[PDB]
Amino acid sequence: WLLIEGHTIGIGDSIADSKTYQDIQNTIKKAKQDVIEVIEKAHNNELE
Amino acid sequence: VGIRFCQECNNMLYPKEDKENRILLYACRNCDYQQEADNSCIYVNKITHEVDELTQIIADVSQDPTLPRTEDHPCQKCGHKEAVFFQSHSARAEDAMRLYYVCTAPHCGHRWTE
Ligand SMILES: [Zn+2]
Numbered sequence: 001w002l003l004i005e006g007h008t009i010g011i012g013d014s015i016a017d018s019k020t021y022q023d024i025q026n027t028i029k030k031a032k033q034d035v036i037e038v039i040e041k042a043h044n045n046e047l048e
Numbered sequence: 049v050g051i052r053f054c055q056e057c058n059n060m061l062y063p064k065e066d067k068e069n070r071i072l073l074y075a076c077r078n079c080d081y082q083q084e085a086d087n088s089c090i091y092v093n094k095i096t097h098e099v100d101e102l103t104q105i106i107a108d109v110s111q112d113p114t115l116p117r118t119e120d121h122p123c124q125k126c127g128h129k130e131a132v133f134f135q136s137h138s139a140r141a142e143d144a145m146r147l148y149y150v151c152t153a154p155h156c157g158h159r160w161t162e
């Protein structure tokens with residue numbers, strides 16, 4: 001039956017849309033900003 | 049706490065008892081020289097070994113291209129805006145990520161911590 005149906009993998013499976021791309025980029029930016037804030041807290045001796 | 053040497057053969061002086069005048073003295077083990085002890089303490093160790101690392105920072109590190117430098121913290125003596133910063137930068141330095149600041153100005157080298 002797989003001869004009739006078919007199965008594959010390609011670029012279109014690994015790609016996503018621009019809304020999801022911008023969401024991912026926003027999450028990465030927020031994470032980097034949080035790490036910068038934690039670094040600032042550590043350097044200012046404000047880390048408990 | 050310090051080590052003082054003999055003035056005759058330049059060997060190490062050792063503390064010893066003066067049993068009649070009841071005073072600590074330093075005497076050489078290789079001759080007969082004796083010297084009165086002013087500090088009146090011999091051995092001391094700090095187990096927690098807290099030391100200011102600002103004394104261990106050479107002022108030459110302002111010429112390092114690899115160290116980061118900031119503009120927000122100015123120097124205290126010359127008021128120079130640019131200054132490099134770095135961490136404790138040593139092993140057995142307990143747990144602290146405290147920054148040490150060195151002014152990167154010519155004929156300067158004031159060191160402060162925040
Ligand atoms: Zn001697």
Ligand SMILES: [Zn+2]
Pocket residue numbers: 123124125126127128151152153156157158
């Ligand atoms: Zn300065």
